[PDB]
Structure formats: C-alpha cells, structure tokens
C-alpha cells in the first residue's frame, strides 16, 4: 500500500536526532543572514536579502522582516512561504490573546505558541517540518525588550544578540566580541550592519540587499514604536555608520 | 400527534415462599374497551430458573423480556455457562430499564425465582429501573386492589391475637405453595369482579429447585 | 489521519524508537536531583556553548508544575514543554475534581503515562525526554523525588541524575549519598548537589542552576552568587 | 480506498534541499517562455502560444487568464497545473476577500493566497508541488500597478520586469538593459514583443503570441452603464489584430 | 420521603423513612433509602428513587476504582464531587435527586455533603431532605448539640423521622438508622413507625394530641 | 517496510513473536496456585542502589479477589491493569457479584491483538493473573500479548522462566500449603536472580478467599527468607 | 518472496502468500475431526497443553443451541469468528424467529474472511474452523478456511497430521453416514478417526474434547470425565 | 411522527380446523372521500402466508415492497427456497413486528395495523397481529379498526376459544367472514362493497379470491321508516 513511499519525517536517528529537523537546519544555513541585537533602549533587526536582481521591486518587497503586532516583529531565515504560514498563525494568536485578556500578548507567550506548533510537526502527523528559523524582537511591560529565536525543532531561547541563517558561527563570534550590556540602539544598529558587512558572501553590502528594523521606546513617551526601514532609509543608515 | 405508548391492561402477581416462588398473571390483552386476546401469555420462563413479566405497554413488555432472555444467553457464552443468580438478573434488568431512562419501557416488571441459599425470591421494578427484593408484589391494572389484600393475608398486617387486644401481633408463619396459590386465585377472582381489564384466564408459573411448573385457571370473560 | 506505526518491536525484542529517544536524553544537558531530610534540590547543567544568552527570558530548566511540585528534564527541549503543559493542566484538573493538589507520585504517574502512550500509538514518535519530578505531598513533610523516561517507566530515588555524563555524577552520588543520614539541612543538600555537578559541569559560573523545594509550597531558585559561594567553599576544602 | 498518503512526499534531503520543489522548478525551466514588464501607467504580461498541433484551435487554450477585473496571470511549466490554479485563484479572490470586504483583493494579497495554495502542495500529505511558475500582473487603488512572480515553493517576489521558463536567463538580461522607471505601457509592450521574439523559433504573429495588459479602466468592457464609481476592468487581452499592428512598428 | 443526616462528637447519624408513593397510592413501605456506597460511605435517597439508586451504586464503583488506583480511601469531598459533577452533566435532562453523601475519614473527620440534581453541592453539619424535611428540622434544631452521646444522637435522628412520618402524608413505613464512624458505618436497625409511634408517645409523653 | 499485522511463512505474527522476546528480557515473576491460595512473587531488579526499591510496583491488585504480577515492558501493563480493574468493577456494577478470574483474564486478552494500521503494536509485557472465585476456586493464569491465556498450577515468566519452570515442574504437587508455596517462590526466585535475594529486591503477595489479595510487608517477607535459609541449611 | 509483505499483493503466478501463510498456521495447530450422519453431527478435538502444569487449550466453541465449531490455529481468531457467528445466529432468531441455516452460516464466515484478504492494513484470519449443526434440512458439517473457502462435507479433519483422519473417514464414508439415531456410535467413529492422526501421545481424560448436535440434541460439549467413556 | 393520508379500513380474520381465513375490502379512503376503489390490501407471501394491512396505504405499499424484497433475499444462495427453507408466516411476522417496533421507537411509525395469516411447515395455523406501536397479540379471531368492534364479536360466536378451532370447517368460517364483511359494509362509513378474501389451507394451499361483493343485503325495511319521531307521512 501507501507505506512503501513514506519518508517517515518524524523519527529519531540511532544517535537520537530528528533527521528532518537536522536537514531543515542545513537548509536554513544557506538562507540570508538575519541578526538581532537587544539594547537597553530598544532592539535592532538587520537581515540580508538573498542574491537579488536590479529588476526586483524592493520598496514593496518583504522576504525577511515581518510584523506580528504593534509590539513584536520577526526576522525570517529559510523558506519564505513556510514562514508566512507561521506568521499568519502568530498574528491570529496575538489577536486572540488581545481579545481574551484585553492586553497585548507578552512576547514569550507568542514565541512559545509558534515554537509549540513547529514541535508538533516533528513528533506527529508524518509531515515535513517548517524549514524556518525566526528571530523574535519585541516588547512588553513585564520583561521589557526581548530577543528570542526558534528553529524547526520547536526549541526557542532568549538572547542579548543573536544571528540566524548563513554564517551564524562567524556572525555570533563578532557579536560576542563587540557587544556590551550598557549598549544603546544607535550603537547596536552599527554593530548589526558591521557584522553583516563582514559575514556576507556578497562582494559589498548595499541598501538593496538589506531589510532593516528597530523597535524603540523612542516613541513619544511611555510607548513603543516599530520601524520597518524603507530602502532610502537603509541607504542613509549605511552611509551614517560608514559602510558605503 | 403520535403517542408511542399504549396500555394493554393486565395484572400480575409475585409471591415469594420459603423454598419456592410464584409469578402469576391474567391472560387478557386489551386496548381501551376492546379485548385483543383472551389468552396472551404474559409471564415467561427466561431460563436459569428465573421467571419474568413486564406488565403495562405490551410492546415495551415484550421488548424487555426479549432483551433479558438474550442477556441470559450471552451471560452463558461470556461467563462459561455460569448460572445467572436472581440477584444478578435483577441488577442486570435495572441497567436494561435505566438504559432507556429518558424514553422508558412503560412497564412494571416483576421477576421471581430462588436466591443462592435456595429461598424464594421476588424482585420488583419501576419503569426506569429502581428495584427491590420483596416478599409480595402485585403489578398492573388491579395492583391497588390486590396489594392491600396481600398485606393482610400474607404479612398479617393489622391482625392481632385474640384475647390480647392489640398487644400481641399475629405471628408471621410461613405459607405453603398450596396456600399461596389459593391467595393468588382469590386475588385474581376478586380483581376480575371489580376491574374491567382483568379476566379471561389466569396463568401461574411456580419456581422451585426442581424447575418451573405452569398452572392455568379460567377467569370470567365479561 | 497519519496512522503509521513508528514505534515497533525488532527481532531481538527492542523498540528502537524508544531506545533512540533515550539517546536524545543522553545528549541533553545534565540534570540532578538530591533529597535531604526536609528538602529536595534540583540541580541542572547549562551548557556554556551559548553565551550572549538572555538568562531572564530563556526557558529555565526547572519548571513548576504546581506551587508544591517541580519538574526538570534532560533531552529535547521542545518535547519537554508538551509534557510540562499536560502536567500543569492535569495538576489543576486534579485540584478541581479531587479538591486536593496532586501527590508527587500521582503527577509522575500521569507524565509517565503520557510518555508510554506515545510509544504504542500510531503516527507519533516517543518523547526524547527523561524527567526528574520532585516536591512534597499536600500536608506532608516527607521529601519526594521521582524519575521518568521515554518508555514510560518511573520510579522513586533518594538521589538521581539524567542526561549527558549522568553516569559520572551517578557514580559520585552513589559513594557520597548515605541513606541512613541524608543531607540534614538545606545547605548540606545544596552543597552535595553542586559538588555532584562540579564532577561534570566545567566552570562553576552560570553553568549550574539550583532550585530548592521545601515543604508547604516553599520553592526558591538560587541566584548566581549564592551558588558561586558553594562553588568557592567546595574547592577551598578540596585544596587539601 | 481512502487517501492513505497522509504523509509528506516533499522532504528535506541531507544537503537541505527540498527535492520535489527543485524538480518542479526544473519542469518550469522546460516550459515555454513567458514574461512580465511593469510600466508607469500599466503592466504587460506575454507568452508564446505553443500549439501542440496545427489542427488544434489555439484560441481555445488561454495561457493568459483574468483572475479579477484588475488582475491577470500568465505561466511557464505544466499547463494543467496552471489551469486549476487559475480556478482556485479566482474562487479564493471571492471567498477569502470579495464576499468579506465587498471589493476585489489587491494584487499582493491575491498573490499571497495563490502562494499559500502552492506552499501547501509542498508540505501537505500525498501531493506533489505545482509544476508552474506564475507571473501575476495587477492594479489596485492604494498599491498602484504591480508585477509578481510565484514559484512552486510558494515563494513570491515583486518585479519591475522579469521572465520565466525556457529562455529566462537570456530574456532577463535583455529586460535589464531596456527597462527604466519612465516607461509608458506602449513602450513596455514594444519591449515585451522584442524580448519574446528571441525565445520563439517558428511563426511570430498575433495568432502564435498571447499578450494581455493591466492598464486603464475599460468602460466599454464593463457590460453596463449607470454607476459612476464602476468604470470597468483594467485587465485587457490584446487581440490577434492588435498584436500584429504593433509587430509592424517592431 | 424524609431523610436526615447530622454531624456530632461521635461521628454522623443518618436516619431515613421507608415510604414510596405514586400520587396518593402507597407503592412501598419497605424502601431502602440509605445506599451503602461502600463500608465507609453512605448516601441518602430523595426525589427520583431510580436516579438515586443507579447513580449512588455507580458512585460506589467510582470510589472503588479510585482507591484501587490511589491505594487510599477516597475523601468524602472527592466522592460527593464525583456524583455532583455527574448529575451536572445531566442538568436539564430531568434527573431528580436530593442526597447526603456521608462519611468519616482521617483528614476530614466526619463530613456530610448535600448533593442535588440541580448541581448543588454543600458541606454542612445538619441536613434534612424530602417532603417531610421541615418536620424533621424542627426536632433536630431544638435538640441538637455537638456533645450528644451516640445513644442520644441515634434517638434524636429516629425521633425526627417519626415527627415527619406522622405529619407528612408521603413519609412513613419505617425508620432506618445508621451511625457513621471512622472505621465504617454501623447499622442500627429497621424501626416500624406504627410500633415506634406508640412506644415514643408513652415513654416520652409526646403526641398528647393523638389518642392512644 | 512491512505490515504490523503480517504473518511469517511459518504462520506466526512477526510482532507478537518479537514482543515475546522483550518479555524474556524482563524481570522474573513466579506464580504458584494451591488449595489454600495462590502466591505471586517477583524480582524487583533495581538498576541502581539509589533507586528506592519499594516504589517498584510489579505486583498489583485488580480486585479484592484478583491479583496480578507482570514481567517485560512494565510500562505497557498500566493500561492492561486499568482495563482489568475497570472490567472487574464494571461487572460488579452490572451483576452485583465478583467477576470470574477466567472472564477477567479473557477481557484482558481481548486487548492483546487490537493492534494494526487501535494501538500501533502488541503489548511487550506478560501477566500472571491470580485469583479466586466460587465456581472454579483458586486459579492462576498466564496472559500473553498473543491474546492466548493458559491456566497453570504453577508458572514462571521473565528472564529466568525456563529454568524456574523446570524447577516448578518438580516441586509442585496438589497438596501444597500456602506457607510451602511462599517458600517455594522465594527459593526459585533466589535461584534465578542475579543479585542475592532479600526483602528489598524481591516481593511476595498472595490471594486467599478470606483476606483477599495482599502484598506482603518487607518485614513479613524477611521472616520467610530467614525461614527459607534455615530449612535449606537443615539438610 | 517479494509478494508476501501484505495480503493485498498477488504473486506472478496468481497466489496470495499471506493467505497461504495463514493457512500454514492451521497446519501447526492441534488436530480436530468432524463427521456426521443423517441425525447427528459430531466434533472431536485433540486439545494441546503448554506443559504439565498448564491446562489444555479449549478447541470447541458453542455458537447457538443448534450450532457450534471446533478450531485449529490462532485461538483468538476463532474467538472473533465464533463471536461473529453467535451474533449472526442471534440476529436470525431475534429478527426472523428463525434458526440460522448452517449453509448460510458458512456463507457469512466466507464473506467475513474474504474482506480481510482484499484490503490493505488488515491480515487474514489465522485459524481453520469445523462447523457442525442441525437445522431444517438435517445434520451438517462445514470446513472453513481463512482464504474464505467454506465446504460442506460428510466428514473431514484439519490441523497437524489431519491427513490420517481424513483418509480414514474417506474409507468409512459409507458406514458412519448410516449411524442414525445412535450418538455414542457416531462419536466412536470420530474418536477412532482422530486416533489416526496421533503420534507418541494418546487420548487421555483432559486431552480429549468432544461435541455433538442432532435431531433432539442441543449442541453440548464433553470434557474431562465425561469423555472417559470413549477413551 | 406523521398523519395517515390514504387509508385502508378493517382487516378481519379467523382460524378454522385446517387453516386460516383473512379478508379486507378494496377501498383506499382519503378522509371522508372514497377515493380509490381498486386497492388490494391482502398481500400473499409465497403460497403459505397472506399479510392483511389496514391504515396508511403509502406505508402499506412500502411494507409490500419489503415483503417482495424479503422473498428475493431468502432465495439468495438458498437451494431449498421453495422447500424446507421457504419463508414461514412466523418468520414474516417476526420480521414485520421488529420493523414496526423499531419505527415506533424512532418516533416515525408505519401507520398500520397488520394481520399475518398463514399455515406453518408442520401444518399449524398462524394468526398474529401487529400495529404502528409494535404491539403484538394472537387469538383465534383477529380484526383491525372497526373489525375489532363488530367482526370479532360475530367471529367469536363461531370460535370462542382454542378448542372450537378443530370443530370449525372452512365453509362455516368463510360464511362467518363473509357475513362480517356485510355487517361492516352496513356500519363502517369508510368501507366498500367490493372485497378480497384469502384462504390458506394446509391441504388445498392458498386460495385467493378477488372481486367479491357484499350480497343478500337487507334494505326493504327502510321504506316503512318515516321522520324522526312524530311524522307519519
Ligand atoms: Mg372483568
């Protein structure tokens, strides 16, 4: 019968590893590098679009940075289509939570929910896992500014600075070298772009090969503002930090 | 509007002796003021020395007896031909009746036989499965006519010993099967006189350790 | 639905999926449980391969199932959340219906039952997780410490360790733990737990987590400095 | 019976490749060349009507399809897969949008919905991916004119101009030289016909070329009059004659 | 029907009448209105006879399963709540039930729970349920003390049923007495109301209204 | 791969035959039926000295008149016990009586073959179901994952089974006392066990008509072990 | 070989190997014998024990007052199929007030066993049955195979070494068919038939099982000292 | 739950020494309207059973089809379909009785009263009743609707108990049935003159008589009856 053709996506190897999760992580390691850096007064999301073209309509394009709600955003690394499935779910979860408790969803609760969904695809159902790794950047009144990452296993962890996608080993070493706890957003912005500029497989880091965002309490008084950078704004910050 | 229930009349009577039991019932079947049958057997031998009668709505009565007889059969299959004891049959019937708690078997069920000590046993059920072991129980149309007579003539209620004037009760001496059958027949003769749905014939099943025996008697046909 | 029998017997009478789930546990960070006279201590290894971590928000290794019971684990992190969630739901369901919080044994039996169910259900793989469940029964001052594993077997332990290099720390505990006289105080119990992890951990910095559970829902997690004081005192006595 | 293939037929290989998606992209590569070019006041999508037989009536086979009055689509790869996608794309534009908001979806969201359908065929049980790459050209009030590409993986990218299928690599290079942000629709149509001629072997005329535009509202194609706000479809398929007229000025 | 149960120094007293009626017709004078859920728990019966019988026997099965799984006697709280949660699922369907779930455990001591077919579950010291509950309450309230002896408590419960059996037309037949201790309930006999009335009247001097 | 419910060329279910191998790896359990009662005894086999051995529950009560001992993948037995208990209690509810040991054993064995592509595999555990009813008296059954149950006068399951069974073959007779059976289980367990038998790594239990099913205290078993040592030294 | 992984796969010669392997389980099973006259039908089974402490596995199951069978192979599969027959016999009685014809009972078993041989996931039944009965057309004996093939016979035998009994019956055909109104002689012929399939072991009191149904004889099984008469 | 629309009135029957007789008129009423005059309400099943049906005609036609189907089904894989394993009256009845009670128990009854008349394999008379409620009973005489009230009294004067059955001949029984049918024609407002009569005898088999008419009617005395009390002319 049908059994003959079954890949069996949800099984352990003899070493105790989930084959598909490991291969999905291998897929993600070829995706454009995304970097998150948390500061005391905000978070920075910086990501690299994959070998673009000159004819690509960049200003209407979104493959890396997505908005989950007004407080939380994500940086994607892997299959974009897979990520959008999960993103729409995450957006619904945040709205459900808001409708139920009349309060914005705390960052971890959202992250846990998405991470649980990914986990489910590795334990039951017989389907392939989502080939996606997220960086969650967000804010709530409990823990303040938070950075998380999830991967196809459904395991998530909290970070001060983190990278996903390609060259994470090189990127994480550079972040670990220059990051400090008392750092500020404008310094983090510079660190993020400097790290990408060194780890990139491209010849030079330009505005058309980047997506950029900041979550700031740099919003008028006790409130938080998300800023998805426009192509021209990414071009300005590249000049400001001294990369182009 | 469709009324799923009907009243087939009839009257039944169970009496538990010291080492025997009787389950009696008239053989008249009716609807309203018409007679359907002058001889429609109402009390059945269900095997394992148990007798049963589900008086009231005959369709539900036949359905229940049929399902119980079936239960006895499957009890043999499932439990190595073990004999269904009268108390186990009673509990089983409770579950059959309560199974239709919200659309009841419109019947007053009585079973009779011998307990595991060889003594006479009668059990009595309401339509939804509540049950109790009793020494004496009439059921159906003329139950209200017969029970008071049995309270007086079986349990000697309100009877005292002459000379003492209310101080000493009449002692509860045991009745023989010939004595019980006389009370059964007089009960049904009296019930036939004063109740229109009672008559035609009386069929008595007598349970002893030897097995089940039947006795038939004519009743007035008006 | 996907009905495929993943967990099945092999010719030698082994369920390889269940055994490979144990290999995932072997990979997991070391966890240790030690019960004193009037307390239980859950020690957990944090691998220092991950720095730049935010320790405020990163999922802690020890989780409260109720106010009186805690659960630590070794193996797949994502898998452990599913068991923790189920256990927490069952803990509240028990309070709702029995009008009494779960015993530590009951909660262990439930979690062990879930793990077992996933070893002979179609379309699912076993949990790559072994747990240490510890706490105190309601209105009881006797310490409780249990262990579960992917196969669904569970048992009580005077002291136990699971995860990577658990063979070494079990070696330490087996010679250092005396049943006739368990760690009489909180100090002694924590000290023995930190000592046992120091056999395996590497640096006694942020690599050791300690959680002390006492009777009557008295659960507290030690800080870095408090643990660092134990680490300091242990090695100063060792220099002799 | 019952569909007993409740497991994924597309799975990650040790190298991190999704084989079936890669192979779907190979099928797309074999397909006939189609292309899209975005101008300032319109978009143009074009392809070759590769007739399987001269006895076949190639007018009955529509490679360029209207999805909504302001959105059109064209493909490269497996025709049957494209046909059912157009059916689903048309329906989803109503069920998940028009029946809710009382208006036709903006290009990007309809593309998003099509992309979702193609992604699900890449993960769902007992199915293979769609063997097509779509080029969806459209217009809406707040986003203006747009042109998207959708791949078998479900990934979609907005383009100024592009080409897919057989001679895509050569065509995209041709488009890169010709495109600018000041093209008028007629200039785009002219470039489209030039670009498309390179990949075509045999006959090159209105009967062997299919070409549509998203441009100005067509009140003559609305079918009714009386409602000022309703001004007619921006999508319009160019006739065999209309194409030949422009082939003389080629 | 008249059923009562009250907590006191020596545990719990449970007392019930025996009558069952269908309209004015006295269907039975020998109804067992105390279910022996198990050797430690008792349940009383009011309202639907079947409903009480069936579901309190069922309760005994659930209590038995509990102690098989947990290796410990079920609490009165837990046992009562199993029944109340069950009848609540059937709420609206037309179940008729008024019962006291009576028991004596180590952790609780003597405990009584009133459980209702509307889903009501109340803990308390004195409960009285049935058509003759008001009559039983009168005797109970005016004579109850925590420091009653097992002998006096047993009589109080018996006398309170007699009060109701007399006045309430739908109560009577006979009085069943139970005394619940921590080591289990103890049956204290079936007492015919007909004989008990004349006995109490003479010895107590009560019921002077009635001619004997 | 191959069907879970596949027949081998010899006419055996592969999975059932493989589950029997898992049961051979299990700790030893021994049952001995006499006319004074049935005795159940198990090897606890703690994997470490830190494991509190009294938490090892390989002997279990099904009802007051039925006890059970297990061997193999003991986690698989929990749902079998739950079913057995439910079946015992349910039958009492429906029939106001104790359920026959055979009927209970049959109800448990009905679960065994409910596997395919119901559960995904057979049970990896064998049970010794011991009890008493009024019809057939004291009974001991052996419930396998094949769905087959055999009644036994004495039976051993687990890793030391065939060595123990050969011992039970010689020792059992129809006039054994309960005390003799107790010492016999302890004797044979001590023979097949790896570690030295004591009250902490072995457990006894029995089912009698009067007292029902009882697991033995470690203090009670310890005395029977000391009584055993002396009687073996007595010749 | 490559076509024995499941029941749904024909071999290149048009064979169903899983069915044939299920058929093999029957041959491993203990011998049972069936035979009838015009008044009575008789089952005779050789029960098998695990060892000397164990009981002897029961081989005969009652289905109704007028019908029953004997098994050879997987006993649980016989329990399933006998339960199914009990229900079908019962349905016939309850609904139609009619005792199920033995031939129709064979048709029902055939069809139930067939569904297991054509579908994926399932498996063939691993047991062979010998059904005896007495209905409105007299005495009957059927032979069920888990391939689905049911066969009405005068006498037969299935199980290990069954060929010896089957040859004996094939010789005795003209004698035992005429044993009318004599249950003890028909049983003797059956006990003599099953004796042809014995090696090393002989018929003891807890080894031999016998059933009988007839004109005025409900299906009744004889075990223990009840069969000592025939040993 | 429904209401009967096109209805059939009394079905009357009785046992006699060698078999049973059953009869029913050929009318399908539509309330007070005597709509259909050629409705056969006796339906033979094989050569040993006749099912007589009163009440709703659409449900009768359904039952008729069930019985027709029952015969077909019984013949399947049954070499003795026309011999030992032929349908018996007792099988046909029990089947119908099951259906009626199941349908009432789903609160969707077949709105009928049915009398299954036949002769069993051993020559015994079968006569049993079942209706929309699933209520069943047997008697030496059986009748439905108005027949119960008027026919039974007349038929019971011939066979008053079980011991009268062997004394009753087919001629006496048929005479009583035919007289009863006349009485019903006088007094039942939903009856017709035309009727069918079936005799199932253990010797002569099934005799089905169609197009019978009520005859020898008394009406002459009507001419003398004038007014409602005091009127003379
Ligand atoms: Mg009368």
From Swiss-Prot, chain C:
Any single Pfam family the record assigns to this protein: Proteasome_A_N
Record has DNA repair as a keyword: no
UniProt xrefs under Gene3D superfamilies: Glutamine Phosphoribosylpyrophosphate, subunit 1, domain 1
BP term (GO), one: proteasomal ubiquitin-independent protein catabolic process
Signal peptide residues on this chain, from the entry's feature table: none
Record key words, sorted: Cytoplasm, Nucleus, Phosphoprotein, Proteasome
Disulfides per UniProt: none
Subcellular location: Cytoplasm; Nucleus
Additional detail: Present with 16800 molecules/cell in log phase SD medium.
Record family assignment: Belongs to the peptidase T1A family.
NCBIfam families the record matches: PRK03996.1 (NF003075)
Protein name per UniProt: Proteasome subunit alpha type-4
Native source species: Saccharomyces cerevisiae (strain ATCC 204508 / S288c) (Baker's yeast)
Source lineage: Eukaryota, Fungi, Dikarya, Ascomycota, Saccharomycotina
Curated annotation (Swiss-Prot), chain D:
Glycyl lysine isopeptide (Lys-Gly) (interchain with G-Cter in ubiquitin), cross-linked positions: 108
A Pfam family this chain is assigned to: Proteasome
Top-level taxon: Eukaryota
Gene3D superfamilies the record matches: Glutamine Phosphoribosylpyrophosphate, subunit 1, domain 1
Gene Ontology BP, a term: proteasomal ubiquitin-independent protein catabolic process
One term under GO cellular component: nucleus
Subcellular location: Cytoplasm; Nucleus
Keywords: Cytoplasm, Isopeptide bond, Nucleus, Proteasome, Ubl conjugation
Subunit details: The 26S proteasome consists of a 20S proteasome core and two 19S regulatory subunits. The 20S proteasome core is composed of 28 subunits that are arranged in four stacked rings, resulting in a barrel-shaped structure. The two end rings are each formed by seven alpha subunits, and the two central rings are each formed by seven beta subunits. The catalytic chamber with the active sites is on the inside of the barrel.
Function per UniProt: The proteasome degrades poly-ubiquitinated proteins in the cytoplasm and in the nucleus. It is essential for the regulated turnover of proteins and for the removal of misfolded proteins. The proteasome is a multicatalytic proteinase complex that is characterized by its ability to cleave peptides with Arg, Phe, Tyr, Leu, and Glu adjacent to the leaving group at neutral or slightly basic pH. It has an ATP-dependent proteolytic activity.
Family the entry assigns: Belongs to the peptidase T1A family.
Additional facts recorded: Present with 7060 molecules/cell in log phase SD medium.
Protein name listed in UniProt: Proteasome subunit alpha type-2
Gene: PRE8
From Swiss-Prot, chain E:
Residues spanning the signal sequence: none
UniProt GO MF annotations: endopeptidase activity; threonine-type endopeptidase activity
Keyword annotations: Cytoplasm, Hydrolase, Nucleus, Protease, Proteasome, Threonine protease, Zymogen
GO BP terms, alphabetized: proteasomal ubiquitin-independent protein catabolic process; proteasome core complex assembly; proteasome-mediated ubiquitin-dependent protein catabolic process
Residues that, per the record, bind bortezomib: 49
Catalytic reaction equation(s): Cleavage of peptide bonds with very broad specificity
Top enzyme class: hydrolase
Compartments it resides in: Cytoplasm; Nucleus
Coiled-coil features, chain-numbered ranges: none
Keyword Transport on entry: no
GO CC term (a single one): peroxisome
Positions of the catalytic residues: 1
Enzyme Commission number(s) from the entry: 3.4.25.1
Quaternary structure, from the entry: The 26S proteasome consists of a 20S proteasome core and two 19S regulatory subunits. The 20S proteasome core is composed of 28 subunits that are arranged in four stacked rings, resulting in a barrel-shaped structure. The two end rings are each formed by seven alpha subunits, and the two central rings are each formed by seven beta subunits. The catalytic chamber with the active sites is on the inside of the barrel.
Name of the featured protein: Proteasome subunit beta type-5
Source organism (scientific name): Saccharomyces cerevisiae (strain ATCC 204508 / S288c)
UniProt lineage: Eukaryota, Fungi, Dikarya, Ascomycota, Saccharomycotina
Residues of the full protein shown: 76 to 287 of 287
From Swiss-Prot, chain F:
Modification Phosphoserine, positions: 48
Major site of localization recorded for this protein: cytoplasm
Role: The proteasome degrades poly-ubiquitinated proteins in the cytoplasm and in the nucleus. It is essential for the regulated turnover of proteins and for the removal of misfolded proteins. The proteasome is a multicatalytic proteinase complex that is characterized by its ability to cleave peptides with Arg, Phe, Tyr, Leu, and Glu adjacent to the leaving group at neutral or slightly basic pH. It has an ATP-dependent proteolytic activity.
Superkingdom of this protein's organism: Eukaryota
Family in the record: Belongs to the peptidase T1A family.
Modified residues (Phosphothreonine): 47
InterPro entries: Ntn_hydrolases_N, Proteasome_alpha, Proteasome_alpha-type, Proteasome_alpha_type_5, Proteasome_asu_N, Proteasome_sua/b
Keyword presence, Cytoplasm: yes
Signal peptide: none
Quaternary assembly: The 26S proteasome consists of a 20S proteasome core and two 19S regulatory subunits. The 20S proteasome core is composed of 28 subunits that are arranged in four stacked rings, resulting in a barrel-shaped structure. The two end rings are each formed by seven alpha subunits, and the two central rings are each formed by seven beta subunits. The catalytic chamber with the active sites is on the inside of the barrel.
One Gene Ontology biological process: proteasome-mediated ubiquitin-dependent protein catabolic process
Keyword entries, A-Z: Cytoplasm, Nucleus, Phosphoprotein, Proteasome
NCBIfam families recorded: PRK03996.1 (NF003075)
Organism annotation: Saccharomyces cerevisiae (strain ATCC 204508 / S288c) (Baker's yeast)
